[PDB]
Structure formats: C-alpha cells, structure tokens
Write a protein that holds these residues in place. Structure first.
Motif, mmCIF file in Angstrom:
data_model
loop_
_atom_site.group_PDB
_atom_site.id
_atom_site.type_symbol
_atom_site.label_atom_id
_atom_site.label_comp_id
_atom_site.label_asym_id
_atom_site.label_seq_id
_atom_site.Cartn_x
_atom_site.Cartn_y
_atom_site.Cartn_z
ATOM 1 N N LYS C 99 0.817 -1.212 0.000
ATOM 2 C CA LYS C 99 0.000 0.000 0.000
ATOM 3 C C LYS C 99 0.850 1.262 0.000
ATOM 4 O O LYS C 99 0.521 2.249 0.659
ATOM 5 N N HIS C 100 1.956 1.250 -0.750
ATOM 6 C CA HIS C 100 2.843 2.408 -0.796
ATOM 7 C C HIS C 100 2.151 3.628 -1.391
ATOM 8 O O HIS C 100 2.532 4.766 -1.086
ATOM 9 N N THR C 101 1.143 3.417 -2.241
ATOM 10 C CA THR C 101 0.452 4.544 -2.857
ATOM 11 C C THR C 101 -0.303 5.374 -1.828
ATOM 12 O O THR C 101 -0.476 6.583 -2.015
ATOM 13 N N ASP C 102 -0.754 4.748 -0.742
ATOM 14 C CA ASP C 102 -1.458 5.461 0.313
ATOM 15 C C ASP C 102 -0.606 5.691 1.554
ATOM 16 O O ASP C 102 -0.943 6.565 2.361
ATOM 17 N N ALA C 116 -3.562 0.843 8.678
ATOM 18 C CA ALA C 116 -2.267 0.199 8.503
ATOM 19 C C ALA C 116 -1.656 -0.301 9.805
ATOM 20 O O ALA C 116 -1.059 -1.380 9.818
ATOM 21 N N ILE C 117 -1.785 0.442 10.907
ATOM 22 C CA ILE C 117 -1.062 0.072 12.123
ATOM 23 C C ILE C 117 -1.923 0.188 13.377
ATOM 24 O O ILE C 117 -1.442 -0.066 14.489
ATOM 25 N N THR C 125 -7.656 -2.566 6.205
ATOM 26 C CA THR C 125 -7.350 -3.021 4.852
ATOM 27 C C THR C 125 -5.912 -2.761 4.417
ATOM 28 O O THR C 125 -5.525 -3.218 3.336
ATOM 29 N N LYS C 126 -5.107 -2.045 5.204
ATOM 30 C CA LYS C 126 -3.795 -1.607 4.732
ATOM 31 C C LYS C 126 -2.656 -2.040 5.652
ATOM 32 O O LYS C 126 -1.560 -1.481 5.569
ATOM 33 N N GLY C 127 -2.885 -3.022 6.520
ATOM 34 C CA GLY C 127 -1.830 -3.523 7.380
ATOM 35 C C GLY C 127 -2.294 -3.878 8.778
ATOM 36 O O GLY C 127 -1.713 -4.753 9.428
ATOM 37 N N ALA C 128 -3.341 -3.195 9.250
ATOM 38 C CA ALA C 128 -3.813 -3.411 10.614
ATOM 39 C C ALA C 128 -4.228 -4.859 10.836
ATOM 40 O O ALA C 128 -3.995 -5.423 11.913
#
Lengths: 208, 210, 158, 155, 214, 215
Positions: C99-102, C116-117, C125-128
């Motif tokens: 998810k580098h774009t976000d 994400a975290i 949806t981005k790492g969590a």
C-alpha cells in the motif's frame, strides 16, 4: 488511586446544536481514557478509546480530544438518538475507575401530557383488589408530579410510579401512575380523579 | 477483536451464594487482565476488581473482597465472580471487560436480583376507557421474576405504544403499557394484550373491550 | 548442573521474545496516540491531521527490526511457532510496502494510517489486519517460551 | 526462593523500557526523512518529520509511565534518576515545539531531537543520551540484584 | 556469513565532479552499514552510519543511500581533500565484516617533476657510506620511472625509493630516490646521474653533479 | 560519545607473545561488545572477533584462534588481545571498535611489528645543494634519516616553524632498518642567507638530533 470527575452533571441541548462533555483526572493519565454512551436499560457502548479514536459503529460526529488531566467528548450537531448518560474511564493498569457520568438530554418544544385514567378492571376485583391507572404520555419537561383526589379528598400513602426514557424520535416522556388499594375502600366512592402539575400550565391537568 | 459472554440472570434471597462466569475468546488481552464492573440500579458504573489471566491472581477493590472471590480457568478462558452471604445491596448488573490494544471489550452483563421473593405468575388486567382517538392499557401486576413480554396483536400494532419499566415492591414486580389509536379502529377491529412470563410458564392473551 | 544450563538456555529465548513484544507495543502506542498529532508546548500532543508519512516510515522501520530479531531467534523446541511469527512479520511488512500509494507519502491521511497500524480500527485493509495476527503469533510464542522456562525451574523442587 | 523472582520483576520491567528506547533509536537512525517505497522499503522524503516526532514523543510518555510504576527500595535512587532523566527529555521536545511541533519538521531538526549520535544535540538528543545511560545504570543494578541472589544455588 | 563486495576497485576523478561507490551485501542487512575514509598511515574515519547519517565533522557533500542488499556512497562535488581508500562495513551482531575497499585518486592536470640531486653528506662520508639522493617533487600522474647512471653506465640495486601520498592541496605526488653506498665505491667514478622519464616529456630530465668539480 | 584508547606500539620477534589493551570510557556499548580489527600492510581492514563486555565471553573468526586469546577486565572497561607464537604475518595495525546507537567508535590503533630487528638509533645526514648553478630562484634542501628501528622518527624543519614546502617521505624498511628522507623547498631569497635546520627525534633510542644544512 486516580479519581475521575465529569462535568456538567446534567445537560439539555436541542437537536442540531453541538455539545462538549468534560472529564478530568486527578493525575496525568497520558490519554488512557475511553468514553461510553449508555441508554436506560442497555449496556454501555464504547464511543472513544485512547482519548481520540472512534470505536466500531460510532458516527463521525463524535470526537475525542484532550491531554494530561483533562479530556473532552464532543458531538458536532446532535441527533435524536444521542441522549443518554455518558461515562469516561481511565484504562491503564488498575483500577479502571469510571467517571460519575453526564446525563445529556435533547431539549425540545414543551408538550402537554395527554392524560388518561382507567377504572379497576372487572377481572381484578373478582380477585379482591382494585387499581386505577393514570397514563401521562408524550410530555416535556420530564418533571411532572401526580397525586389523586377521591370523592373530594385526596390520597398519597400507597402508590407506584414508573417513568419511561426519552423517546428516540420525538424526545417526549411518558409516565404511568397506578394506585392499588383494597376493594374495601374503593367501592364506597363513585368517581375518582388524577392530578398532575407540569410547567406547561399553571392549572393542573385533570381527568376523572 | 475479543468476545466475552457472561452467565444468565440470577435470582437469590439474602444469605445464599451466587457464582457468575464470563468466557473470553478471540485475541489475547493485551495486559492479560479481565475486570469486573458493578452497576446497581440508580448508581453508576463502579470498578470491582481484575484477575490475572496468566496466573489467576485476584485483585479486588477495598469494597469487594469480604464476600467476593475471583477465580479463573485457563482451558475455557472463563473468569468467575462469586458473592457469598448475598445482601440486597448486591442487587446489580455485573459486567466483565478486557482490552486489546487500548480498545475495551464488554458485555453482555449479568443481572443479579437478591430478594426474598419466589416465582409468581402475574395477574394481567385490561384497562377499558372524547377526541377522535382513544387510549387503552394493560396492567401486569404482582409477578416475579423479570422479564415479562408484553405486545399488542402479536407485535403487529406498535405505533402509539408506551410500555413502562417494571418496578418492585413487596417483592413482586408491577408493569403497565398503554396503546393509543384513532376512534375509527376501536372498538371495531380486534386488539389484544399478549403477556408472557416464561418463569411461571404463563402465556396470557387478553382482549380489551368496552 | 545439567539443568543449570537448560534453565539459562530457556530464559534467553524468553528475553529475546519479550524484546520483540515490547517493540510491537511501541507500534501500538504510536498508532493509538501519535496519528494525526503534533508536538505541543504544554499539552504534549495536539491535533495535526493528515501528514502521517514520517510516522509510518517509523512503523516500517520498527517492523524491519522485529523481523530482524525473529530471524535471529533460534530454538528447536519452539521452531514451528517462531517461524509462524516470522511469516506473520514478513506478511505485515509486505502489506505496508504493497500500500505504498497510500502510505508512502508525507501526507498519509489519518484514516489510512489507522487502517495500517491501528489493529483495533474498524477497517484494517492496509496492514492493521496482518499486524494483529503478528501480535497473536508472538503471544503464542511468548506463552510457550514461558512454559519452557517454567518446565526447567520446576525441576528443582520435585 | 521468591525474592529471587521478586527482583526478576524489576529486571523484566527495566528490559521493557530498554526495548522501548531501542525503538526510538531505530526510527531516529532509519526513519527520519524517509517514506514507504514498494521495492526499497524506505526511500527519501525530506523535511516532513512532524508525525514521526509525535510518535517519538508518545513512546517517550509511555517510557515515563513505565518508570513511574517501578517501585523497589533497593534501586529506588537509580529509578528516580531514570525518572528525572525521562522527564527532562520529554520536557525538552515540548520546549522545542517551535521546531518539532509542526508537520514539516526538517531532517536536521529531527536528528537534533532524537538521534543521540548526531553531531549537534540541541533539541532533545542530548537529554535522550542521558536517558539511555540512566536506564543502562538501572539495568546493570537490576542485573546485580538477581545475580547476587541466584549465586545462592552454588554458594 | 554476509560478505560485502565493493565496487569499483579504484577511481580517478577531478575536483568538482561527482563520485559514487557501491557496497553490496550477500544478504539483506537492514541498512546497518557504515562508510569509512582512510588516508595512508591514519586510522579510518567514519563518514556515514546506519546507511544514511553523516558522522561527526563530515561535510554535507557526502551522502549515503540504498536498502536491502545494495548501498552506495556519493560525493556530489569532490574536493581535493577527499583522496583515500573507502570502505563499507556491516554493523550488526557479529561479524562486522568489511568491504574490499575502493581507492579514490583525484584526477588533475599533468605536472612535470622538479628534480633535485644532492651530494653525499661529509659526515656520512666519514661513516663508511655515501648518498646521492634524487628528489622528484610535485608531478602528475603518479606513474614515474627513474634510472641511475654512474659516469654513463646504469645502477639498479642498492636503490631505495618512496613516494608520498597525493598532496592534500594540489593533488601532486612526490618521490625520493636515495643512493647510500660504500664510500670507497663513491670515491672512484666521476659523474652520477638520476634521470626519470615521465608522461610530461619525451626524453628524460637530467640533473647531475661532479665530485671534484667546484 | 565513546572514547577508545589502545596500547603503545609493539616490536616483537617471531615466536614471542604480545598483549594489547583497549580501554573504553563514556557511554555503554548498546550491544555490550567490543570488536577487534586487524589491518596488515597492503591489505584492507579485517574483522577478528568480539568480546562480551558483560560476560567476558570471546568470539573469534576461524582465521583467529588456537593462538589468539581475548579477555576483558570489567572493573576498568579494558579489553585485551593476546597473540602467542607470533609470526611475520601478524605484523599489522590492530584496532578496537564498538558502537553506541548505530555510530561506530574507533582508534587509535596499536602497531605491531614482528621482526628480527632491534632498537637502533638513526644517523642523520644534511643534504646540501650542489655548488654550481643556482638554477631557479628556488633551492630545495634535503634531510636523510637512515638505519633506525623502530618507527617512528619525527622530523621537523626549524622546530616546526618551516612547514610549507616540505615533503617528508614514508619510511621504508630494508634489512631490519628503516630509511626516511625529507625535502624542503624554499626560494634562494632565503638560503644560505638565514638559518634552516633539520630536527629529528627517535624516542625509542632516546635520540635528539639537529643538523644544519650548509653549502
């Protein structure tokens, strides 16, 4: 240990306005605080956690802010569903002590109670007792005070009252007052009335 | 996320003992703790104590360990709260909570009613009756324990309703409910009161007429 | 003395795991308390929305180190559950890269950093999501390393 | 055989603080002026270190929380030195809020705050280095409390 | 273990131009990489640590980059003080292995060597020996070749030569060629020559003295 | 910041044993280790091993044990590298390093020379310019230090007051004796008009020599 204090104790804000509740701890708690909403008869629901994070299913109109000793829950605008008593809680180590709670109600246009009185039922006084019920529905403000006059005189010694919670749609209240009595005394007196004083009128509402 | 499921409601009289449970599942509690909360009627939320989920070590507030015992089982992840020599002041709904990260997980709560009362069916009474809308009612009186289910026409009529919370005195609950309807409907269409008190295995459907 | 060294071996495994546990606890802290925040003169942290890039760079860097510590962790008894954590670690870090774009911009939005975290956020949806599994996989390892130690200090009073 | 385990507790609690401090090192040495890249992991992104500074502050508050919870009469003077060192560090970052309390914190400013090995340590890094050694002093003393009592096995 | 290979082996770059060296680890090392500059006869000086951070006193014209297994050091505008051998190092756990090094020379315009010859000191003549020393000063490029003729005929052993490193100021080299010989041998032959050939000139510079002359 | 100071230079012969030291001060090494590095002449830097500054446990490369031995005195923060049955290939500069954060702290190095040589003072010979043509207005003058062991000698011109125009050349070893020269360039403006002297010191042989350079 650490003691939590909330303010204000009670609060009536109408729908659309924004509100702010305050929680203050007696020490720094490094943002280890949660907010809850609790409706009458239901479990508390987590709104905010770690001071500034919204919990599951919480609308974006709720927000948490604060640091150190003082924190605040804010509802931007207000909806008919956001009444209830809100609590803060210190969540770290032990104890996880709760605040005293802030009772918030929706302020609304004042409404007169539609009052209804009902005689003791036929099935009831075959069992040997008698009870006359007085229903006081859809009013505002909450504080109403009922008594009952009997054949000229009035009565107060043995009566039971139950109040509803603020209605989620029209922000009104309702109160049931039932006077139960041994059919010894009821059968003597032909007609009965129910007496209620509310700020909607100086003269008390009356139904016989 | 984490789930916590507690026991069903309990009715006891002063002197005897109750033990409530709360079984956790899902992720591991971040600080390995399960906490108990007391909510008495009219009073706020009050922290009681916590138990270590790794070692089962109980830790109670100074108000809650003369008659109170916290215990834990690990295979099933259930905490146990036991109150002995039950007093009326013990009447409350008790919660069992825990945290993952800084999120707190709750519920569902367990109600404890300490009272000398025994199971008693209700006596349900219809309330018979200007303005093109008339109001009617139902009087459920003298029962124990809670709950009582009250509806109007199998729940098919739910506008104009105000059922009121039950209140206790002389060790028996009393509940009422009021319906309001335009004079075109009644007494021309079938209404009815449905009350259900499963404790006494009572199902009573009663029709209010003039 | 046959056990005197095996108790010492078991405790080294525990210390290494507890270090991994503490660094993960720091990701938890910044996700819950630093997202959307800036340093403040008196309040410590104040609100500052939608520039979480450098913070997430930090989360990635802490996670590089967690992966590095777990790869250095070696014990025959807990092999399966070490490698389980390792694969959770590599799955978490790879998710953040994906998810580098976000996440790979100075202006990382608050909402996206939480996905994400912030393992307790409503959306993950981005790492969590993967982060939470990493937490659990390490506590399965920690719960077991403790039993390995407990099984050895046990051997002195029976 | 439980004062032996009673001082284990203070050693494990200090080790945790030591690990939290190691994370501030990591982001200082490897996250300042960086962003997430899909192929490289971390790539260049200069002068927007405010959020990373907020994480460093939040880790530091947590450290201060941990040290305040450390109670033991044996190491109490060394714990209090660690406590003061932590509070002096955190107070330094808030003092430098004009340079670190903003989104666009420059790389130079950030290294001067949390990179204890930077040539200039004007915005917090100096106090951080003393925080490290303060915990190191405590870690050694904790590692002597168990070691002198664990010597009971063969002495 | 994790081997570190450096590239290129050597570079010759002019002042003001750019320089990039590569360090490649055999496995991912998580940016745990240091860079050193080492001048001849001095300890290595730390330039970059943790892959990107400049060390104490290092000018901003240095930088570190890279991730995973490939890293690089760059000098965006090279100053004449920056000659030396450059090393990378993996800095984590054990071992902390080094790269093979990269020798950086500063390219520069050609310069002819200023050549000087000196007679055996009189006190050295009382010693038992005799020295005719040839100084070759401030020449570029480094590659130089020197002969030694004795009244016309050469001499190829007993010769001992040493260069300095690149001058930190103007990037030229210097060379000394010394001739400490038995004294009787110096007391037989007339003319002694010490004449090197450089890319600067076709034919050799010729500097020479005479024993009984003057 | 952490400072490392190491032993003085060492000259041994094949067969003997040497021990070097390295004392640390300042902050603690974050990973509690001190690493040793060897640099043989003409070779790069090579990692030898490390010692745990808490336990004193040594760890070495396969290239370095059965021979090399590493210890540490915790009270004084002093590491120790002892090498036995020394061979010519042990000739190197030995460094001692360690880290705080990710920053590596170094120096200054210990120089070890294993050789059959013995301490010998240098003889110094002033190298005067050749009479005949004062070609160019610039006169270059030389000093030659010859036949000494061990390194180093320190050479200055007029006690360090003459620094520009100097080229001191690296000492080169031949037959267990070092030779070193130095050249000073200066315009005939100056020489032989005023006083220029060659100052050399060799503390190993307690030698102090000044030799003026005259036509």
């Amino acid at each position: 240990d650490i003691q939590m204090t909330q303010s204000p104790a009670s609060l009536s804000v109408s729908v659309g306005e924004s509100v702010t509740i305050i929680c203050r701890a007696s020490e720094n708690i490094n943002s280890n605080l949660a907010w809850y909403q609790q409706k009458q008869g239901k479990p508390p629901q987590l709104l905010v956690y770690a001071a500034t994070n919204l919990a599951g299913g919480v609308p974006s109109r709720f927000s948490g802010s604060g640091s150190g000793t003082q924190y605040s829950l804010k509802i931007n605008s207000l909806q008919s569903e956001d009444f209830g008593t809100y609590y803060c809680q210190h969540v770290w180590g032990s104890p996880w002590t709760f605040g005293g709670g802030t009772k918030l109600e929706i302020k609304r246009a004042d409404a007169a109670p539609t009052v209804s009185i009902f005689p003791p039922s036929s099935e009831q006084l075959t069992s040997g007792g008698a009870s006359v019920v007085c229903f006081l529905n859809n009013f505002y403000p909450k504080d109403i005070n009922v008594k009952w006059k009997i054949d000229g005189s009035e009565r107060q010694n043995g009566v039971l009252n139950s109040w509803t919670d603020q209605d989620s749609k029209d922000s009104t209240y309702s109160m049931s007052s039932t006077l139960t009595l041994t059919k010894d005394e009821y059968e003597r007196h032909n007609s009965y009335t129910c007496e209620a004083t509310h700020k909607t009128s100086t003269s008390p509402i009356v139904k016989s | 996320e984490v789930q916590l499921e507690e026991s069903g409601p309990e009715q006891k009289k002063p002197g005897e003992t109750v033990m409530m449970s709360c079984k956790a599942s899902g992720y591991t509690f971040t600080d390995h703790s399960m906490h108990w909360v007391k909510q008495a009627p009219g009073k706020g939320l009050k922290w009681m104590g916590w138990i270590n989920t790794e070692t089962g070590e109980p830790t109670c507030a100074d108000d809650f360990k003369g008659r109170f015992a916290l215990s834990l089982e690990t295979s099933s992840r259930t905490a146990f709260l036991q109150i002995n020599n039950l007093k009326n002041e013990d009447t409350a709904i008790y919660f069992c909570i825990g945290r993952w990260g800084y999120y707190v997980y709750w519920g569902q709560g367990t109600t404890l009613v300490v009272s000398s009362a025994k199971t008693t069916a209700p006596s349900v009474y219809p309330l018979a009756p200007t303005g093109s809308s008339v109001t009617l009612g139902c009087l459920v009186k003298g029962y124990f324990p809670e709950p009582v289910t009250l509806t109007w026409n199998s729940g098919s009529l739910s506008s104009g309703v105000h059922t009121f919370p039950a209140v206790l005195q002389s060790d028996l609950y009393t509940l009422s409910s009021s319906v309001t309807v335009t004079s075109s409907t009644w007494p021309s269409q079938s209404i009815t009161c449905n009350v259900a008190h499963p404790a006494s295995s009572t199902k009573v459907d009663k029709k209010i007429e003039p | 003395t046959e056990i005197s060294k095996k108790i010492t071996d078991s405790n080294a495994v525990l210390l290494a795991v507890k270090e991994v546990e503490a660094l993960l606890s720091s990701i938890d802290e910044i996700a819950a308390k630093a997202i959307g925040k800036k340093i403040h003169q008196n309040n410590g942290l104040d609100t500052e929305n939608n520039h979480n890039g450098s913070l997430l760079a930090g989360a990635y860097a802490i996670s590089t180190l967690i992966k590095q510590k777990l790869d250095g962790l070696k014990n025959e008894g807990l092999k399966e559950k070490i490698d389980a954590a390792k694969k959770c670690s590599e799955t978490f870090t790879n998710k953040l890269k994906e998810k580098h774009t976000d996440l790979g911009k100075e202006g990382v939005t608050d909402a996206d950093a939480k996905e994400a975290i912030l393992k307790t956020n409503g959306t993950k949806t981005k790492g969590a999501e993967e982060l939470g599994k990493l937490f659990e996989s390490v506590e399965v390892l920690s719960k077991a390393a403790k039993e390995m130690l407990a099984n050895s200090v046990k051997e002195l009073t029976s």
